[PDB]
Structure 1
Amino acid sequence: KITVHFINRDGETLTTKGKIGDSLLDVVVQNNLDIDGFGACEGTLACSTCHLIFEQHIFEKLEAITDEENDMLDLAYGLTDRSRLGCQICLTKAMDNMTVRVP
C-alpha cells in the first residue's frame, strides 16, 4: 500500500492510503474522502469531477492518455499541463507519498 496526499479545494490536505493498481477514484471512494462531487459518473468518462493535478515527475510517467479521456478532460475546470482524470490513473510504486491537487 502507498500514501497519497490530496490538497482539496478548501486547502485542507487529505492523507490516505491505497493499494497499487487502485484508481485514484477508488482511493477517494473507499476512504470516504470529503471531495465535493468527486467521481460523479463513477469512472465512465462522462464527467470531469475526478480531475486531479499531478506533480510533474509523476505526470510525465503516467500511462498514455486516451482520446476518450482527453475529450472529457477538455471540459474540466482549472485545467493545467499536469492534469488527468483520476478515475483513469492507477497507483504505482513511484506514487508513494505523492501529492495531487483538486482544482
Structure 2
Amino acid sequence: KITVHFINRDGETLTTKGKIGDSLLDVVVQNNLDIDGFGACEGTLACSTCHLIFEQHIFEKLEAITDEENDMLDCAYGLTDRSRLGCQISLTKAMDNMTVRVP
C-alpha cells in the first residue's frame, strides 16, 4: 500500500492510503474522502469531477492518455499541463507519498 496526499479545494490536505493498481477514484471512494462531487459518473468518462493535478515527475510517467479521456478532460475546470482524470490513473510504486491537487 502507498500514501497519497490530496490538497482539496478548501486547502485542507487529505492523507490516505491505497493499494497499487487502485484508481485514484477508488482511493477517494473507499476512504470516504470529503471531495465535493468527486467521481460523479463513477469512472465512465462522462464527467470531469475526478480531475486531479499531478506533480510533474509523476505526470510525465503516467500511462498514455486516451482520446476518450482527453475529450472529457477538455471540459474540466482549472485545467493545467499536469492534469488527468483520476478515475483513469492507477497507483504505482513511484506514487508513494505523492501529492495531487483538486482544482
- Which TM-score tier does this pair reach, normalised by the shorter chain? over 0.9
Question: Shift of residue 43 of structure 1?
Answer: 0.0
Alignment correspondent of 1:4: 4
The CA deviation string for residues 50-73 of structure 1, in whole angstroms up to 9 with x for no partner, is 000000000000000000000000
Q: Percent same amino acid among aligned pairs?
A: 98
SS of 1:65's equivalent in the other structure is coil
Question: Shift of residue 83 of structure 1?
Answer: 0.0
Distance 1:56 1:99 in 2: 11
Question: Shift of residue 74 of structure 1?
Answer: 0.0
| Ranges in structure 1 where 5+ consecutive residues have no aligned partner | none
Alignment correspondent of 1:72: 72
TM-score using structure 1 length: 1.00
Distance 2:41 2:19 in 1: 22
Once superposed, which parts of structure 1, at least 4 consecutive aligned residues long, lie more than 3 Å away?
Answer: none
| Ranges in structure 2 where 5+ consecutive residues have no aligned partner | none
Distance 2:43 2:61 in 1: 21
